[PDB]
């Protein structure tokens, strides 16, 4: 059986989000992409280092906003304006939130050498598309 990105059915008590619920055959039929970088089009050079930096961003922001990122991020990349739009929860204090925003806001700018911008989007509870 195919076991790639398919959360199996439990007993009907398993909260799950649109992203996790959809399987890889819906990857742009129903889901779309979580990272919008241009390198995977027909003619371009640097797609490999874009992905190497992509997995880095996913894991840095995962370990730097500890246990508050509701679902996964949207690493869009237009011009030299990398963007880390988020869906972060409403549990930690806003001064801590603004702090980790600033810390990231400048640290990825000095790691990747371009404008990096985080536009958080606070949400009360981790969303549920269906209970599996």
């Amino acid at each position: 059986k195919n076991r790639a990105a398919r959360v199996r059915v439990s007993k009907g008590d398993k909260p799950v989000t649109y992203e996790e619920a959809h399987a890889p055959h819906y990857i742009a039929h129903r889901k779309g992409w979580l990272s919008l970088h241009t390198g995977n089009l027909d003619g371009e050079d640097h797609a490999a280092e874009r992905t190497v930096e992509d997995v880095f961003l996913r894991k840095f922001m995962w370990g730097t906003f500890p246990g508050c990122l509701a679902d996964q991020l949207v690493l869009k990349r237009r011009g030299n304006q990398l963007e880390i739009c988020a869906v972060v929860l409403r549990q930690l204090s806003p001064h801590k939130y603004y702090f980790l925003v600033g810390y990231s806001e400048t640290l990825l700018s000095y790691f990747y050498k371009c404008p990096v911008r985080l536009h958080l989007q606070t949400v009360p509870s981790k969303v549920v598309y269906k209970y599996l």
Binding site: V55, K59, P66, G67, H95, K96, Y98, F99
Partner: protein, 320 residues
């Protein structure tokens, strides 16, 4: 390589193998201890870093707090014993779950009587376990009943059994709210239950299931001997059959048209009227059938004549 690291949710899924732990941390605590201004310490505007003494004392407090945490995991919970430890037979599940019909069962006690691991064979899986449980519910005022719950999980079976028995209750009539009206001999299938009405203070000298059931019913003093097959799911059913098919004193008085009167040896020759007919009184006296044709029990006659020699019979046991 930070690139080859992974989420903890994924590390444990592999460590436990249950498909065939970071909570004590503040948001900026570092080994180096560079206590920041947005994390840990609040937002005078002065960056700083604690010293070798404050670090060691704080991390010592943290490791001790871990130790007390493994203590609050490794306490002991006290389970009351039912009929033995590692059994389920006297275990009191709580009150039955409140009815969704705006209802409540709070004066009702549920006690298990039998837990069995029950299996069937499937074409794909093979041996498939299903827990089968029997529970009895009672408020000590006459209303009691039993039911079977079956599930794959024991908690689900318990819930099904008790929430079904409250809908399948009986009503047992009691003499003076302590004993049964008469002596009941009943054979249900291949289980023989023989119960005797007994005076006050006799205690519940019955089979342990009968003791739990009669504590849920409110019967305090009775003798009971079971013979034949001791199946629990025939024992409870025969017990409830006999106790719900008792004949009371007022029904006997109404059926015969005569006074039902008592003669205790404790009071004396004094007649104590317990039930008079609610209609007319029959004036032909009861026929004194000399040498009555009644089927007697050889165990009762053996005990009467003193030829019942057992090293097990009248043993000094605990209360009820």
């Amino acid at each position: 390589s930070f690139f080859t690291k992974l989420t903890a949710d994924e590390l444990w899924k592999g460590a436990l193998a249950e498909t065939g732990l970071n909570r004590g941390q503040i948001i900026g605590e570092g080994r180096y201890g560079f206590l920041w201004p947005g994390l840990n310490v609040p937002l005078v505007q002065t960056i700083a870093q604690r010293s070798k003494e404050e670090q060691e004392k704080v991390e010592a407090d943290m490791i001790q707090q871990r130790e007390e945490w493994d203590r609050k995991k490794k306490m002991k919970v006290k389970r009351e014993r039912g009929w033995s430890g590692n059994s389920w037979g006297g275990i009191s599940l709580g009150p039955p779950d409140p009815g969704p019909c705006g209802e409540t069962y709070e004066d009702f006690d549920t006690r298990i009587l039998e837990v069995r691991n029950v299996f069937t064979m499937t074409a794909k899986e093979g041996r498939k376990k299903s827990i089968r449980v029997l529970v009895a519910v009672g408020n000590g005022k006459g209303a009691a009943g039993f039911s079977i719950g079956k599930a794959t999980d024991r908690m689900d079976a318990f819930r099904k059994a008790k929430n079904r028995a409250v809908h399948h209750l009986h009503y047992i009539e009691r003499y003076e709210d302590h004993t049964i009206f008469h002596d009941i001999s009943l054979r249900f299938k291949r289980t023989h239950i023989k119960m005797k009405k007994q005076p006050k203070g006799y205690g519940l000298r019955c089979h342990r299931a009968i003791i739990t059931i009669c504590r849920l019913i409110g019967i305090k003093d009775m003798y009971a001997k079971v013979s034949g097959s001791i199946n629990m799911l025939s024992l409870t059913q025969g017990l409830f059959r006999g106790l719900s098919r008792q004949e009371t004193h007022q029904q006997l008085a109404d059926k015969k048209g005569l006074h039902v009167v008592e003669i205790r040896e404790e009071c004396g020759p004094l007649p104590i009227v317990v039930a008079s007919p609610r209609g007319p009184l029959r004036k032909d006296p009861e026929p004194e059938d000399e040498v009555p044709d009644v089927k007697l029990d050889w165990e009762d006659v053996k005990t009467a004549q003193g030829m019942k020699r057992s090293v097990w019979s009248n043993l000094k046991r605990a209360a009820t």
